[PDB]
Amino acid sequence: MSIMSYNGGAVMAMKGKNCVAIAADRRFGIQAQMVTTDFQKIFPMGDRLYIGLAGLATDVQTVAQRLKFRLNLYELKEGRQIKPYTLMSMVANLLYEKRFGPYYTEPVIAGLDPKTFKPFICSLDLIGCPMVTDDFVVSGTCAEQMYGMCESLWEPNMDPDHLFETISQAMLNAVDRDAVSGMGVIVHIIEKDKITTRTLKARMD
Amino acid sequence: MFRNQYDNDVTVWSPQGRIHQIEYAMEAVKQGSATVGLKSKTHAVLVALKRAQSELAAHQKKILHVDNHIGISIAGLTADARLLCNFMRQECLDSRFVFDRPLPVSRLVSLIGSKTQIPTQRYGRRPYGVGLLIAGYDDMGPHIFQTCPSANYFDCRAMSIGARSQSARTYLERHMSEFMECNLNELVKHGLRALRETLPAEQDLTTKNVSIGIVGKDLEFTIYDDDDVSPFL
Amino acid sequence: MSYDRAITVFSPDGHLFQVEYAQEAVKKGSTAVGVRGRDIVVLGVEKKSVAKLQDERTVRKICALDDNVCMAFAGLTADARIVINRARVECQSHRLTVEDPVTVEYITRYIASLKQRYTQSNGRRPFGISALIVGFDFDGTPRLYQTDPSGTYHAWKANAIGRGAKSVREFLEKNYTDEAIETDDLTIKLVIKALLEVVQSGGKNIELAVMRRDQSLKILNPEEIEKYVAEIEKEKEENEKKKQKKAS
Amino acid sequence: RGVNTFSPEGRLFQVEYAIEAIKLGSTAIGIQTSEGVCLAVEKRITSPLMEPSSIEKIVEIDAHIGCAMSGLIADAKTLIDKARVETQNHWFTYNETMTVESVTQAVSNLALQFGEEDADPGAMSRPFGVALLFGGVDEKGPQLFHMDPSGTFVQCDARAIGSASEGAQSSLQEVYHKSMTLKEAIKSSLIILKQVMEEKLNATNIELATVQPGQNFHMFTKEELEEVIKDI
Amino acid sequence: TNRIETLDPALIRPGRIDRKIEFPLPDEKTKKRIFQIHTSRMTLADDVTLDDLIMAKDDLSGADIKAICTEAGLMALRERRMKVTNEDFKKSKENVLYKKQEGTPEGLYL
Amino acid sequence: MAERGYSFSLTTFSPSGKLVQIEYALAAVAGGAPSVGIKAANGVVLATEKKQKSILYDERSVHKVEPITKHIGLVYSGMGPDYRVLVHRARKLAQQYYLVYQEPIPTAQLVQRVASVMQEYTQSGGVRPFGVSLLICGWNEGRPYLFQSDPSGAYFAWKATAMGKNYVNGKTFLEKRYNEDLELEDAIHTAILTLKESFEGQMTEDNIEVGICNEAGFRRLTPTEVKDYLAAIA
Amino acid sequence: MSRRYDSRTTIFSPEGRLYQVEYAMEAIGHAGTCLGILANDGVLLAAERRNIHKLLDEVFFSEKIYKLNEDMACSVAGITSDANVLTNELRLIAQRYLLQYQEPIPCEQLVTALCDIKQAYTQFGGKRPFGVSLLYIGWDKHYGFQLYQSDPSGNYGGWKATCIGNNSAAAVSMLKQDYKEGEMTLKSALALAIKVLNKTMDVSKLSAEKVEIATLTRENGKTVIRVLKQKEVEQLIKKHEEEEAKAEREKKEKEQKEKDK
Amino acid sequence: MEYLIGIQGPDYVLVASDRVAASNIVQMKDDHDKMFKMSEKILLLCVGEAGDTVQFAEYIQKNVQLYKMRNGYELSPTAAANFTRRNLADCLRSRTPYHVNLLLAGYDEHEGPALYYMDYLAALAKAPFAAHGYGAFLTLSILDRYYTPTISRERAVELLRKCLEELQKRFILNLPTFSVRIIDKNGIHDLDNI
């Protein structure tokens, strides 16, 4: 359909108090023909910082590798850690170069800084403009609907156990929206003492 | 001393302000063959000597057909001369394409000069060490020029290059008045005589070395080669 | 800057000094010999080792290009590698076009061409290394070609190059001019003998690597050389006694 | 101390040096006769473990022009690649025959590139150290030219170049004649070639070739060489 | 002269001087030969391993060798013994090695 | 030419294994007016002397401390023109790189860039390296600060250092007096004393230039402010 | 002319080598000792620290030891100025390889890049040469632990144990003896380094501040990288000192036992 | 036309590859197969534009062998796939048109075999079995139904047989059957077709 839509995909992040959460889909087919129900589109760079990317799969692989190159070298020269903010910027600069070309990607950053102990989320646009997110973060083609759900479901205070229910149902609602049958999803639940990874049970065709 | 210094600088200037490079270049012209140039200013002739290194050889040409109304004799090394000659032929070709005019040989000669002069005026370029007698039959008649690798452009009514140039010059000045604006035949005889003056003169006249080349009112570029000069002898 | 400038100079009396000095640089280097049989081509090299903290992981003079052609050298390790690389791509350029591997001679010609090219061109100079090039093609004919930094290449039956060349060259001259018969066992034996004279004893100083056809490239065991060494001593003593005893 | 120098004499240094380098090489002989050009050479040998079978120094540029070269042998390998192609290019363009002489000029332009100055466009720092005897057959019949390392060409009918050249050329005169048999010549050539040698006369260090109109450029084989030995 | 490549060909002049004589570097066998004469002079013992010291040596000419013995001989003299031991040879071989080198290696051409 | 000239460098390996031009620059450094630096830990103090030699001057015209950034500052000993130029290129590089990012500058990275420009000039010919030595002074958070940069291309950390004429003698004075906990006001008193000891031609509120890095980085002292300290202990 | 400024540099001569190349070696020799011991368990790296003062500061442990990879580290011998330029390109090529190949660069390949640079300069470039030597402490997942060495002369080696820096000849000899072909562990190595290091040092007192020591071992990821702390280093030294005292004491007891002199 | 099927047994990989040899608009000959054997550890199948396939394949063969000789080591086939993918990823963006689908069939010496499918949007995936082209439609239902993770060797040969009978039955194309290859760690063999 589009230049991002041939394999669809959506990604959600929600914030809790003293924790943050990132959930995503998995599926890779070729056009509309589903071959496999796997394909990670979220990678992390260091434990706690998570980056979710949402272009075309082809683009995503190349961009994730670019961010690795840059970040590693940067980290090396300064000789101390990178911050979440720093990753956000970096993405922008990269986002700006790709704007002439047909690589269009939407990233989302999530993580909780544990050398500062604050939660951090952002979304970024495919024309390169960074927009600092709050409380909920959306990505995917389904976004208009997804936004609707996130404004409704949220409540100002959240515990990992409540946060878990919120994302799960969000994810459940989200898979029905796909025309590309993007079945399979992962959750990562992040604390500044622990990370949980959960693959979830959902519809199968 | 400082002979090596003066070779090493092509930007050379001395207390007497001389430029040795030019000097060297002049010795190289004198090393070449014997050539004379003569014009009546309605006909122009050049006797040129073409020589051979050894017995089992045969003479190498020093009369070049540059064009079907213009031409030269070379006096100095063969290799550099070839390079210059391509530039001048192509300059004649665009004149023909664009303008469809022959173009004054006078105008031509002056242009070639600049392009050489400017690389002596900076790093690189050794002297080219060939001097030329350039003839051509233009709109206002034939004209004769001496091009030097010092880019010294002069029109003369006759001239000579080759060791013992001066000898033949003095005869040309003497016979100068006799040349007038006629007779083909006469110009050549004087040339044959004159050419004898350029040589050591212990070497007797030969028909295989000499070569006679004419351009004139209704003439263009023609060469008399070997035996062919005997009819006109 | 761009630095076109001739680093090289030109001959003052018909002698390129820099190329005279390149031959000296070869005299200082190692000793290599190559022998050809008719199902075998042997490349021997000598070693100087007194370290035993050094790994034998290390690269060796006999270098792998295509699967039946090897290159042995004298000079510096560094320079030789650049030469190897150029060959390794080149075989592959050919592998694509000709759809088969080419002749040995052809490979040699390319390397040679760069070396004379660097003398003749401004603002460059050749490495100054000399090599032994050896291999086979589809045929069982064995090939030994010699490359030298005078920008030339040539065929030999036998060759020895490097330090102390004169003594061995003549030895070798005796050794193989009564053989029009293969004797591969003896050929290796004779090569170790040839090489023995420069090491100053010790198989511990001697490496033979054998290339026989059908894709057989071997570096000998410590033990195989030791067996060969024992056979040479036993035969010399037995023969000395034997010549006096025969009186014929 | 430039080599971009013209020289105070005005006679460039580098060209003069080349002749010396040449005096160190072998001897190469050419006689062109009334019909046919012969080129004879010494490819030499020295050791018994050498294969000069491999070696050559007389090459056919094409099937109607050849050349024998003499001097710093590696340079001549560069020299031929350029020429051979240039000839071949004329066949693509007009599918026609080139003159021996046209081919010789083309290569002489390339003889001048030495220096990085502004009389020569740089690529080389120095010239080719070789002379060549360029032969061919065309409608101007069999002809021979002597390519002079001085980047110039002179025409010839008989020439020797080599270490021995001073003597050889003298020897070449008595035997030369404006009309002489081709076969007769080959014997005459053989005599001068014999005189120069210190090493054995065998068919494994000397090489003959001729060009005749009736059979193209032909390199002479061993069996043929051995027969020529028998006659003299 | 230490090095003859310092010299001038004017200085040589062929047809006076025609001979240029070059001492090879230390060659392994030679070291043992030179040594056998130096030890003969000195006391010797049945716990000496002549090869082992020569083997341990590389690129050392006769003077250092003549020197090693002399050095060692002094140590012994302090002990007031005329018997020589391995140990003596080791300290002296180490002192001379310590002093000549501080360079880094250009080997490993294999 | 326009691309001809000397491709290799003036500086050259010696059988000494020293670098001649480099050796000379320690001399070039030597000639400098007296400089010091004190790190007050929470603060930083850098100080130098303005020599004066013509009564004819204006204002306090050119400085010898210029701000690269709003957080790092340079002072030097060596040649003045070189200093102006050195500051311009760096100053350009500091802003461009750290406006791509919005993060504020790390100290080490500036040092890495100044040293490279110094080093490329050692690598290449035609142009000669600069013959200045710098004190890179900054403040940021709880990080260490006060760094020195050589015309050599080398860097080192320090707590205290001195430059200019009689550098070795002043440093020996410095070494003894400078110990443990001190105050930003206190560090200034000491630096004036250490400069006076090196040489006093005089000191006025215009022979001295003192700058600090403390509250929110680099701040420039008033002329009156310093004068208060001169009275506070002469 | 168009060039005549030059001093006829970077050319050959009857020397048959290159003058400038030779020169560099002596400067390598000056610089503080670095030692590599390679064992069947781990890799031990130790380097001896130059001039330190109380006005001078420690901002890292890293001041002779530099990480080129998350399984490679090196000790650099040579002037600081040159080395930092060189180091960056070396880090950078590993990242190319990482991009394409999507797994770490072979150790041998990374060593190959450095010699290639140098060699180009010696054939012709217009830029003066340099001289740096690295001692490589490295690992692999199908070839095990690797230690290598590089020299500017374009000769690199592999070693069980090597040392370079001041008193290179003597240190190499001692190192050769104390060693045993295989049968080596880290604990044996801790002693081995110091024993050899002390004998090259002129300063009679040994202290944890004059040394840097590190080991690269494996357990997790590809490796665990250990940077040894000053108290731990001091502890090794004292323990070791007490062993030298102890050896000496046993020897004196044997001399008395033979019959005292 | 263009079709390629694969199945990875835990002991070998069978692949079905295309055949032609005189194909314009007629059939008169079929013998040639658009596959190149990348080495003896990895084999590669391809379909796409006919000219582009040969041009692409040869560059990749040339390079992989250089690395083998230079390292004196062999790359993992997984390692090879990302490399191949990276090259094709450039191309897509550029003016030149390589947008062909590749199948890298590989055997890992001490990791067991692995099968990779490459698309023309550039996308690399591993599947125990997949297929592409016109062939795929018919085959994949059989493969899903008859195959069960880690089936025997004997079972695969029967399963491949069924495909040819389906292709015959339903009727598609105009040339008959496929060419089948066996890739193993004993190298590459051949499964004859009717």
> In sequence order, what are the residues at sequence separation of 6 or more whose Cβ sits closer than 8 angstroms to the Cβ of residue F77?
F29, F32, F33, F35, F48, F132, F133, F163, F164
Which two three-digit tokens encode residue B131? 């001097």
CATH 3.90.79.10, domain D1-232, yes or no: no
What distance in Å separates the CA atoms of residue D158 and residue D144, rounded to the nearest whole number?
Answer: 8
Torsion angles phi and psi, residue D67, rounded to 5: -155, 150
Which chains contact A through at least 3 pairs of Cβ atoms less than 8 Å apart? Answer: F, G, H
> Which residues have C-beta within 8 Å of that of residue H190, sequence separation ≥ 6?
H180, H181, H182
Option in G28, G156, G173 nearest E104 (CB):
G28
Number of domains in chain B: 1
Query: Are H and C close enough to touch, i.e. 3+ CB pairs under 8 angstroms?
Result: yes
What does R_g of chain F's alpha carbons equal in angstroms? 18
Inter-chain touch D75–C116, beta carbons under 8 Å: yes
Q: Which contiguous run of DSSP H or E holds residue G99?
A: helix G80-101
Amino acid occupying residue F104: P
Establish if C245 belongs to a structural domain.
no
Residue-range domain boundaries for chain D: 1-232
| DSSP conformational letter for H185 | B
CA proximity to H64, closest of G101, A61, G94: G101
Question: Any chain A CB within 8 A of the CB of H137?
Answer: no
The minimum CA-CA distance between A59 and chain H, rounded to whole Å, is 9
- By CB atoms closer than 10 A (0-12, 13-18, 19+), residue C13 is exposed
**Residue-range definition of the domain harbouring residue B166:** 4-233
Cα gap F122→F153, rounded to integer Å? 9
**Which residues does chain G have within 8 Å of residue H75's beta carbon, measured at their own beta carbons?**
101
Q: Do H65 and C92 touch (CB under 8 A)?
A: yes
Residue C46's nearest CA partner among C80, C4, C74, C13 is C74
Calpha distance A27→A180 (Å, rounded): 9
Give the torsion sign (CA, D146, D147, D149, D154).
positive
- Round to whole Å and give the CA distance between A8 and A177: 10
Class (C level, CATH) for F4-233: alpha beta
Alpha-carbon D18 to chain mean position: 15
Give ∠ CA H145-H16-H45 in degrees, rounded to 5. 125
Residue whose pair of structure tokens reads 């000192």 in the numeric block? G241
| Rg (alpha carbons) of chain E, rounded to whole number | 19
Q: Is G19 exposed, middle or buried (0-12, 13-18, 19+ CB in 10 A)?
A: middle
Residue at B48: amino acid letter: A
Compute the distance between CA of residue C114 and CA of residue C121 in angstroms, rounded to an integer.
10
Interface of C with H in 89-108 (CB under 8 A): 89, 92, 95-96
Coil, helix or strand at residue D144: strand
Instruction: Give G163's contacts in chain C (Cβ within 8 Å).
Output: none
The SS3 call for residue G120 is helix
Q: How far, CA to CA in Å, does G41 sit from each of B76, C65, D182, G163, G237?
A: 81, 36, 85, 19, 21
Instruction: Report yes or no: D168 and D41 within 8 Å, Cβ to Cβ.
Output: no
| Rounded Cα gap, residues D93 and D89, in angstroms | 6
Nearest residue on chain D to B82, alpha-carbon basis: D109
Residue A41 with chain H: CB contacts under 8 Å: none
The domain of H106 spans 1-194
Residue type, B46: L
CA gap B5, B17 in Å, rounded: 14
Outline where D24-121 has alpha helix (H). Answer: 73-94, 100-110
F167 Cβ neighbours under 8 A, 6+ residues apart: F29, F30
- Identify which of E104, E106, E107 has the shortest CB distance to residue G168: E104
**Separation between Cα atoms, residue B220 and residue G177, nearest integer Å:** 97
Farthest-apart Cα atoms in chain H, separation: 51
Q: Which strand (E) or helix (H) includes residue G111? A: helix G107-123
Whether the Cβ atoms of residue D172 and residue D161 lie closer than 8 Å to each other? no
What residues form DSSP beta bridges with C162? C31
Which domains does chain A show, CATH number per domain? Answer: 2-205 (3.60.20.10)
Query: B162 vs B95, B191, B211, CA distance in Å?
Result: 33, 14, 15
Token couple for B91: 């300059």
Q: Which residues of G touch A73 (CB under 8 A)?
A: 91-92, 95
Q: At what angle do helices E62-78 and E28-41 cross, to 10 degrees?
A: 40
Which residues in chain A touch residue G60, judged by CB atoms under 8 angstroms apart? 79
Give the mutation candidate from C3, C4, C5 for the F interface (greatest F CB count, under 10 A).
C3
Do D4 and G2 count as a contact with CB atoms less than 8 A apart? yes
Tokens at B20, concatenated: 């040795």
Distance CA F37, CA C14 (A): 66
Contact E63, E52 (CB under 8 A): no
Cβ of E8 under 8 Å from any chain G Cβ? no
Closest CB from G14, G153, G170 relative to E106? G153
Chain G: nearest CA to C108, how far in angstroms?
21
Closest to D186 measured CA to CA, from D28, D61, D30, D63: D30
Q: Exposed, middle or buried: residue B86 (CB in 10 Å: 0-12, 13-18, 19+)?
A: exposed
Across the beta sheet with H179-184, the strand order is: H129-133, H3-8, H13-17, H179-184, H187-191
The 3-state secondary structure of B121-186 reads: CCCCCCCCCCEEEEEEEECCEEEEEEECCCCCCEECCEEEECCCHHHHHHHHHHCHHHHCCCCHHH
Contact by Cβ (8 Å): D190, D228: yes
Q: Chain C contact for D74, CB < 8 A?
A: yes
Cβ–Cβ gap C78/G155 under 8 Å? yes
Judge whether D60 and D216 are in contact, CB under 8 Å: no
| CB-based contact G37:G192 (threshold 8 Å) | yes
Residue of G nearest to D116 (CA): G2
- Print the domain residue range for C207: 2-240
Give the containing element (helix H, strand E) for B79. Answer: helix B78-94
Domains of chain G: 2-249 (3.60.20.10)
CA atoms within 13 A on the CB side of D59: 16
Q: Considering CB atoms only, which of G23, G84, G127 is closest to F13?
A: G23
> Residues F8, G127: contact at Cβ < 8 Å?
yes
What H48-54 contacts at long range (C-beta under 8 Å, 24+ apart), as own/partner pairs, is H48/H2, H48/H98, H48/H99, H48/H100, H48/H101, H48/H102, H48/H120, H49/H97, H49/H99, H49/H100, H52/H97, H52/H98, H52/H99, H52/H100, H53/H100
Q: Could you give the CA distance from residue A85 to residue A63 in angstroms, rounded to a whole number?
A: 18
**Does H62 contact chain C (CB < 8 Å)?**
yes
CA distance B128 to B151: 10
Cross-sheet strand order for the sheet of A195-199 = A136-140, A10-16, A19-25, A185-190, A195-199
Domain count, chain H: 1
CA dist list (Å): A17 to A133, A135, H118: 15, 10, 43
Task: Give the technique used to solve this structure.
Answer: cryo-EM
3-state secondary structure of A6: coil
Please name the helix (run of DSSP H) or strand (run of DSSP E) that holds residue A130, with its range, or none.
strand A130-131
Of F31, F29, F22, nearest to F128 by C-alpha is F22
Domains contained in chain C, number: 1
